[PDB]
Structures are given as structure tokens and as C-alpha cells.
Amino acid sequence: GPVPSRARVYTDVNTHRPREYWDYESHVVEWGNQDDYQLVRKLGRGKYSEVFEAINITNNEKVVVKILKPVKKKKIKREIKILENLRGGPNIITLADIVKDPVSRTPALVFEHVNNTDFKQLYQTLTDYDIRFYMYEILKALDYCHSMGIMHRDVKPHNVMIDHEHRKLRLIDWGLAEFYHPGQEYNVRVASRYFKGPELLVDYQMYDYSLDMWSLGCMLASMIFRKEPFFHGHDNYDQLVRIAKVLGTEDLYDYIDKYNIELDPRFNDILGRHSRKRWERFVHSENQHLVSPEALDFLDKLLRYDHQSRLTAREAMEHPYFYTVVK
Ligand SMILES: C#Cc1cccc(Nc2nc3cc(C(=O)O)ccc3c3cncnc23)c1
């Protein structure tokens, strides 16, 4: 079968935590008072919930309320336990309360409110400095959650809320996050298409924190090159082909061969042969001010087929790309 894999860092975090920490199915939710919060306006809904701006009438503060759809009850305590485990961590959104909504008959998560500028608008204006600065803030959040034995699995621009005024960043929507246990096989149906790691795309289930680092690399490439999303596939198969047109097919084969993985035969007549490209090819007069040798080398070290070969969050923070960011 497949060759097994282990995270190269934080491998045994959960192994030596108490069972209460990671056994989320045993978690007992501490309920707050649903009457404390008044819905103000609907912000949107995903496949799993509806999110509302609201006011906390005990202090008149703005908050956000995420009313979970009655689907996949297991996921509910997973997301709750992960938020409580990570609460107070750098740049991790704060879960302020949990209440039972009387209409949906489901849990409603109450989060801190972030006065953000949507990425579709924000990304048009980021400077070279802004991108390094915010990348560094994202890494703080990822090193934190990885060091706490959790992978996010849904890193994408929408989940990185940024108040550009106060230069405040929060990593949100831990609804796809999971505990990392060495040797555990996970569902590959996670992340948004454009940010799915090659591991998910070739059906390799024994992945780990390094998945987030691929997603981060996709974000970075979209920011420095001003092309969002960068790998813009039409479906999960074309997504891998798009990647292979940049990283090349030989290193893809090396990857699947290392883990003795077999490509879906559907790729037989769509994958072709492709050389690995140099990142400079994506540079032009409209994004060159965002690009530097340090940026390209950092990106290159994030976007690797082999999950074991990508920079960890901690290593990424040590990269020359961030020397110019004020600490
Ligand atoms: C569905 C939807 C939808 C569509 C557009 C905008 C938003 N806005 C916000 N979503 C959040 C989600 C979470 C979470 O899921 O952990 C935490 C905090 C926020 C948040 C905080 N502050 C301001 N806005 C949001 C949501």
C-alpha cells in the first residue's frame, strides 16, 4: 500500500496531552445565555452555517454569531473544542460564547467581531510591506495551532480576516480543523479547490500540518503575482494539472513514487508532460514591485509536492523575506 508519513514537527503533541484535550467527542459544552445576543444583519452562509453580525447587549459590543446547520453533529464538538484549545493564541479568532439558538435548535457560536476589508478589495491595495507583514501574522497563527496539535485545513483569503486600519489579523472558521495524531488517515475532501495540497489531490490520507503551508503558498503566490486565485482549476483533476504545469510532471511522479501512491487513471489523458518553471515567468510590470528574490525563494520553499519538504511555520518565520518586517 501507501508508504506511511509523519509530521516532521509537533509530531507527538496530542500523544502527551491529556485525553480531555483531543477527545472532542467527550466534550461537554458550557452554554451561555442566548438572550445576551441580538442579531443585527445576516453576513452570509456557507455549507455548514449562517453568520450574522450581532450585538452583545450585556456590554453593547459588536460580535458575530455563527448558527450551525443541523448537519454532521460530530463536526460541532470538534470545532468547539479546537476553538477553546486555541483561545488566546496569537491571531486566532476568539470564541466568546456558545448558546443554543431557539429557532435552528442548534449551537450558535459567538465570535469576536473584526472590522475587516474583504480580500477581493484588500488584495488590490496591499504593498510589498503589507504582504510580508500580514504573511508573518498568519504564520504566528499557524505555528501556534500546529504547536497545539491542530491543523486548520481551510486556509484561504476568506478565512484570514484583516482589519487594515489597526493592522489586525484573525484566522477564522476552524470548522474543518482536526487534531493531528501520527499515522492517522484523514479525509482528503477539505480546503477550497484552489488551495488543496497535492496530497489531497492524489488521495494521500496520512497528511499533517504541512497541508496548511501549501495553502499559504497559494495565497502568497496570489498576492505577490496579483493573480487570485493563483492555481485556478475547473475541478479537482484540472487543479492538479494546473499545478503540474508550474511544478512540472517529473517531480510529481517523484512525489507519488516516494509514497508509492498511484495517480487516478483519469489523469492518463489530461496530465501530459511538463517541465518545472522558474517563478520569474509570472513577474510583469504590474506586480514587479511586490516581487523580490526573497519572495520568490520563500514561495518556492512553500510550494513543494512533497509535504515533508515544505517549510514549517516556524522555519518560514526565519526566512529572509521577513527581515524587513518590523518586530
Ligand atoms: C458565512 C459567512 C460570511 C460571509 C461573509 C462575511 C462573513 N464574516 C465573518 N465571519 C466570521 C466567521 C467566523 C468563523 O466561522 O469562525 C468567525 C468570525 C467571523 C467574522 C468576524 N468579524 C466580522 N465578520 C466575520 C461571514
Curated annotation (Swiss-Prot):
<dbReference type="GO" id="GO:0004674">
    <property type="term" value="F:protein serine/threonine kinase activity"/>
</dbReference>
<dbReference type="GO" id="GO:0005886">
    <property type="term" value="C:plasma membrane"/>
</dbReference>
<keyword id="KW-0418">Kinase</keyword>
<keyword id="KW-0539">Nucleus</keyword>
<keyword id="KW-0808">Transferase</keyword>
<dbReference type="GO" id="GO:0005524">
    <property type="term" value="F:ATP binding"/>
</dbReference>
<keyword id="KW-0090">Biological rhythms</keyword>
<keyword id="KW-0131">Cell cycle</keyword>
<keyword id="KW-0547">Nucleotide-binding</keyword>
<dbReference type="GO" id="GO:0075342">
    <property type="term" value="P:symbiont-mediated disruption of host cell PML body"/>
</dbReference>
<keyword id="KW-0597">Phosphoprotein</keyword>
<dbReference type="GO" id="GO:0006974">
    <property type="term" value="P:DNA damage response"/>
</dbReference>
<keyword id="KW-0723">Serine/threonine-protein kinase</keyword>
<dbReference type="GO" id="GO:1901797">
    <property type="term" value="P:negative regulation of signal transduction by p53 class mediator"/>
</dbReference>
<keyword id="KW-0879">Wnt signaling pathway</keyword>
<keyword id="KW-0225">Disease variant</keyword>
<comment type="function">
    <text>Catalytic subunit of a constitutively active serine/threonine-protein kinase complex that phosphorylates a large number of substrates containing acidic residues C-terminal to the phosphorylated serine or threonine. Regulates numerous cellular processes, such as cell cycle progression, apoptosis and transcription, as well as viral infection. May act as a regulatory node which integrates and coordinates numerous signals leading to an appropriate cellular response.</text>
</comment>
<feature type="region of interest" description="Interaction with beta subunit">
    <location>
        <begin position="34"/>
        <end position="39"/>
    </location>
</feature>
<dbReference type="GO" id="GO:0030307">
    <property type="term" value="P:positive regulation of cell growth"/>
</dbReference>
<dbReference type="GO" id="GO:0016055">
    <property type="term" value="P:Wnt signaling pathway"/>
</dbReference>
<dbReference type="GO" id="GO:0045732">
    <property type="term" value="P:positive regulation of protein catabolic process"/>
</dbReference>
<keyword id="KW-0804">Transcription</keyword>
<keyword id="KW-0053">Apoptosis</keyword>
<dbReference type="GO" id="GO:0042802">
    <property type="term" value="F:identical protein binding"/>
</dbReference>
<dbReference type="GO" id="GO:1905818">
    <property type="term" value="P:regulation of chromosome separation"/>
</dbReference>
<feature type="domain" description="Protein kinase">
    <location>
        <begin position="37"/>
        <end position="322"/>
    </location>
</feature>
<dbReference type="GO" id="GO:0005634">
    <property type="term" value="C:nucleus"/>
</dbReference>
<protein>
    <recommendedName>
        <fullName>Casein kinase II subunit alpha</fullName>
        <ecNumber>2.7.11.1</ecNumber>
    </recommendedName>
</protein>
<dbReference type="GO" id="GO:1905337">
    <property type="term" value="P:positive regulation of aggrephagy"/>
</dbReference>
<dbReference type="GO" id="GO:2001234">
    <property type="term" value="P:negative regulation of apoptotic signaling pathway"/>
</dbReference>
<dbReference type="GO" id="GO:0048511">
    <property type="term" value="P:rhythmic process"/>
</dbReference>
<keyword id="KW-0067">ATP-binding</keyword>
<dbReference type="GO" id="GO:0005829">
    <property type="term" value="C:cytosol"/>
</dbReference>
<dbReference type="GO" id="GO:0016301">
    <property type="term" value="F:kinase activity"/>
</dbReference>
<comment type="similarity">
    <text>Belongs to the protein kinase superfamily. Ser/Thr protein kinase family. CK2 subfamily.</text>
</comment>
<feature type="binding site">
    <location>
        <position position="66"/>
    </location>
    <ligand>
        <name>ATP</name>
    </ligand>
</feature>
<dbReference type="GO" id="GO:0051726">
    <property type="term" value="P:regulation of cell cycle"/>
</dbReference>
<dbReference type="GO" id="GO:0006915">
    <property type="term" value="P:apoptotic process"/>
</dbReference>
<keyword id="KW-0805">Transcription regulation</keyword>
<comment type="subunit">
    <text>Heterotetramer composed of two catalytic subunits (alpha chain and/or alpha' chain) and two regulatory subunits (beta chains). The tetramer can exist as a combination of 2 alpha/2 beta, 2 alpha'/2 beta or 1 alpha/1 alpha'/2 beta subunits. Also part of a CK2-SPT16-SSRP1 complex composed of SSRP1, SUPT16H, CSNK2A1, CSNK2A2 and CSNK2B, which forms following UV irradiation. Interacts with RNPS1. Interacts with SNAI1. Interacts with PML (isoform PML-12). Interacts with CCAR2. Interacts with HIRIP3.</text>
</comment>
<dbReference type="GO" id="GO:0017148">
    <property type="term" value="P:negative regulation of translation"/>
</dbReference>
<dbReference type="GO" id="GO:0006302">
    <property type="term" value="P:double-strand break repair"/>
</dbReference>
